[PDB]
Amino acid sequence: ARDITLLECVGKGRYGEVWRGSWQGENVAVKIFSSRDEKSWFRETELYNTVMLRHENILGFIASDMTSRHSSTQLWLITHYHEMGSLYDYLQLTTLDTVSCLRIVLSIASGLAHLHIEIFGKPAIAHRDLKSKNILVKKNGQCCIADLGLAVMHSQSTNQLDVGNNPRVGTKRYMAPEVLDETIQVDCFDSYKRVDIWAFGLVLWEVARRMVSNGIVEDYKPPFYDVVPNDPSFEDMRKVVCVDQQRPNIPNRWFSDPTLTSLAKLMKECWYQNPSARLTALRIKKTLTKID
Amino acid sequence: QRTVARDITLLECVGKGRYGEVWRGSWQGENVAVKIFSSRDEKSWFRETELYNTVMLRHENILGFIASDMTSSTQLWLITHYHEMGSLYDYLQLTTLDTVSCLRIVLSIASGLAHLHIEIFGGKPAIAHRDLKSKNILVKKNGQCCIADLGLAVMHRVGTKRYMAPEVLDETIQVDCFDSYKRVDIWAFGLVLWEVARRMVSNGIVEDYKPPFYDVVPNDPSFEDMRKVVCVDQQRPNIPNRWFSDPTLTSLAKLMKECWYQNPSARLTALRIKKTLTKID
Ligand SMILES: COc1cc(-c2cncc(-c3ccc(C4CCN(C)CC4)cc3)c2C)cc(OC)c1OC
Numbered sequence: 053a054r055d056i057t058l059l060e061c062v063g064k065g066r067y068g069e070v071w072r073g074s075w076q077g078e079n080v081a082v083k084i085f086s087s088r089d090e091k092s093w094f095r096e097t098e099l100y101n102t103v104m105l106r107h108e109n110i111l112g113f114i115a116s117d118m119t120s121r122h123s124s125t126q127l128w129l130i131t132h133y134h135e136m137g138s139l140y141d142y143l144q145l146t147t148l149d150t151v152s153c154l155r156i157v158l159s160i161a162s163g164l165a166h167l168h169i170e171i172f173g174k175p176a177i178a179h180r181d182l183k184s185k186n187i188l189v190k191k192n193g194q195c196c197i198a199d200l201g202l203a204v205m206h207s208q209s210t211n212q213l214d215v216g217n218n219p220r221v222g223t224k225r226y227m228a229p230e231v232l233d234e235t236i237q238v239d240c241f242d243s244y245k246r247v248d249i250w251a252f253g254l255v256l257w258e259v260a261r262r263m264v265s266n267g268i269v270e271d272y273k274p275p276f277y278d279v280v281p282n283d284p285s286f287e288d289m290r291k292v293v294c295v296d297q298q299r300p301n302i303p304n305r306w307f308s309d310p311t312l313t314s315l316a317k318l319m320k321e322c323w324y325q326n327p328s329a330r331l332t333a334l335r336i337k338k339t340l341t342k343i344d
Numbered sequence: 345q346r347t348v349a350r351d352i353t354l355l356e357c358v359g360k361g362r363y364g365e366v367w368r369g370s371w372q373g374e375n376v377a378v379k380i381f382s383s384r385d386e387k388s389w390f391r392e393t394e395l396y397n398t399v400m401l402r403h404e405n406i407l408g409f410i411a412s413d414m415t416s417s418t419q420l421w422l423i424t425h426y427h428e429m430g431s432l433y434d435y436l437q438l439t440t441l442d443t444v445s446c447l448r449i450v451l452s453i454a455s456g457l458a459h460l461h462i463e464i465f466g467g468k469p470a471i472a473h474r475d476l477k478s479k480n481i482l483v484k485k486n487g488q489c490c491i492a493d494l495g496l497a498v499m500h501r502v503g504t505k506r507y508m509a510p511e512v513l514d515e516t517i518q519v520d521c522f523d524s525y526k527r528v529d530i531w532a533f534g535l536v537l538w539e540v541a542r543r544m545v546s547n548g549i550v551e552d553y554k555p556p557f558y559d560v561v562p563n564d565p566s567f568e569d570m571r572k573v574v575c576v577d578q579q580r581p582n583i584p585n586r587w588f589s590d591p592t593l594t595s596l597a598k599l600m601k602e603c604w605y606q607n608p609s610a611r612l613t614a615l616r617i618k619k620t621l622t623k624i625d
Pocket residue numbers: 119120121124371374410411
C-alpha cells in the first residue's frame with residue numbers, strides 16, 4: 053500500500069508546500085519542493101539514507117521521490133505528521149510552566165546532540181538551519197528537529213567531510229556572527245556544529261520568554277525583533293550581530309527564577325563571538341538534564 | 345485535494361545481478377521497469393538521481409526516466425520506461441541483422457551518446473556515461489536503441505573491465521580533462537559497433553555473437569588480463585575477411601578502427617561518428 057491522499061495545505065513558502073495527507077490510514081506530511089530548492093530535496097534524501105539517523109527528536113522519514121514526465125519534475129518528501137505544528141506556531145499562543153519549558157528545550161538538545169555525535173552507524177551531522185519553524189511539537193510535550201536540506205556530514209573514522217552542493221544559506225535571523233561576516237572556516241566540520249549552537253541559544257531564548265514566573269511572562273517575539281527591521285536582510289543581521297555585537301536581552305524577571313537564571317546562563321554560553329568558546333550540544337544536554 | 349497512486353505492481357523479474365534486480369512492473373495499467381538497488385550499488389542510485397535532479401534528460405535514444413524512490417533498511421528504486429525486447433546483448437544472441445537494421449541500431453546509439461556528450465547552453469551539461477556496453481543498451485520496437493544506466497555518469501564502482509580503454513587500464517587517463525571521459529566512451533562504442541556488425545548478414549555469412557576480446561581473455565577477465573591485451577600487446581578485435589565484400593561492413597570496420605586509436609585524442613567524436621553513419625548506404 054503506497055497510495056497517498058493530499059487533504060490540506062499546512063504550509064506554503066519559497067520552500068514549496070507541505071500537505072497533511074493520509075497514507076495506510078495514518079496522517080503523513082508531504083513536502084513538495086519548489087524547483088528553486090531542488091538541491092535541498094537531494095541533500096535531505098542523502099541525510100535520510102543514514103543508517104541510525106532515526107530518533108524520537110528527529111522528524112521521522114517515510115519516503116522520498118523525484119518524479120518526472122516530459123520537462124517537469126516533482127520532488128516529494130513524506131514524513132510523520134505533527135498536528136500541533138512547529139514550535140514557532142505553538143509559542144505564539146501557549147505559555148509554559150517549568151516542567152513543559154525544560155521538556156521542550158531538553159528534547160531539542162537531545163535531538164541536536166544525536167545529530168552532532170558520530171555513531172561507529174551514523175556520521176556526525178551539523179543542521180545549519182536550526183530555528184523554531186524547523187522544530188515540531190509532539191503530543192508528549194517533546195519536540196523533533198526537521199529540515200535536513202542544508203546538513204553537513206563528517207566521519208572522524210575515515211576523515212571525510214561532506215558539505216554537499218547547496219547554495220542555500222541558513223535563515224538570516226538565526227545566522228551566527230561567523231556566517232554573517234563570512235569568516236566561517238568552510239572546510240572545518242566543528243565550524244558547522246558551532247553555528248548550530250548559536251541558533252540553539254536563540255531558540256532557548258524564544259522558549260524561555262514563554263515560561264511563566266511570579267505571574268509574569270513575555271509575549272512571543274523572534275530573535276532580534278527590537279534591533280532589526282521586520283523582514284531583516286543579511287546586512288541588517290550583520291549590522292546588529294557583528295558590528296553592534298548585540299545579543300537578545302535577558303528580561304530581569306528571569307533572575308528571580310532559578311530555572312530561568314540557569315537558562316539565561318546557558319544561552320549566553322551559546323552566543324560567544326568566538327565559536328570555540330561555545331558549549332557543545334552534549335554539554336547543553338547534560339546541563340538541562342541537571343536543571344529543574 | 346488529490347490521490348497520488350504510487351503503488352507499482354512488480355510482475356516479473358527480468359534481471360538479477362550484483363546491482364540488485366530489474367522487474368517489469370505496472371503503474372496505472374502501463375508497463376514500467378523497476379531497478380531495485382543492492383546495498384553494493386547504492387551509490388549508483390544516488391549518482392543517477394543527482395544527475396536527473398540537475399537535468400531532466402529527454403531523448404529517444406536515452407532510457408526514459410520516470411522516478412527515483414527511497415522508502416524507509418532503506419529500499420532504493422529507479423523507475424524507467426520498459427522495453428520488452430530487452431538489451432542489445434540479449435537481442436544479438438539469437439537475432440541476425442540486415443543492412444537497414446544494423447545501421448538503424450548503431451546510428452541510434454551514436455545519437456544517444458552524442459546527446460549525452462554535448463553541452464547545450466540556456467539545455468544540459470556535457471555527460472560521459474563511463475559504462476557503455478551492449479548490456480546497457482535496450483532495443484525498442486521501432487528498431488532504434490536507447491542507452492541505459494547513468495549510475496556511473498559524470499557531468500561537466502568502475503567501468504566494465506572488458507570495455508575499458510587503454511588509458512583506463514594503464515592509468516594514463518587525463519582525469520583533469522572532461523574530454524578524457526568522452527574518449528573512454530568512444531572506445532567502448534567502437535567495441536559495441538563490432539558486436540553488432542558481426543551479426544549483420546552479408547553474402548549468406550554471419551559471425552556468432554561473441555563479446556569483445558572473447559578469443560584473447562578469460563570468460564571473466566581480470567584488470568591485468570585486459571591491460572596485457574589492450575595496452576602491452578595493443579590487440580584489437582578481429583575484422584573478418586567477409587566484411588570487405590560488403591560496402592556497409594567495410595565502412596563500419598573503418599569507423600570502429602577510428603574509435604580504437606591508442607591516442608585518445610585521435611579517436612572520432614560522437615558527432616563525427618553520426619555524420620559518418622548518415623553517409624553509409
Ligand atoms: C511520473 O510519471 C508519470 C506522471 C504522470 C502524471 C500524473 N499526474 C499528473 C501529472 C502532471 C500534471 C500536470 C503537470 C503540470 C502541467 C502544466 N503546469 C500547470 C504545471 C503542472 C505536471 C504533471 C503527471 C505528469 C503520468 C504518467 O504517465 C501517464 C507518468 O508516467 C508513468
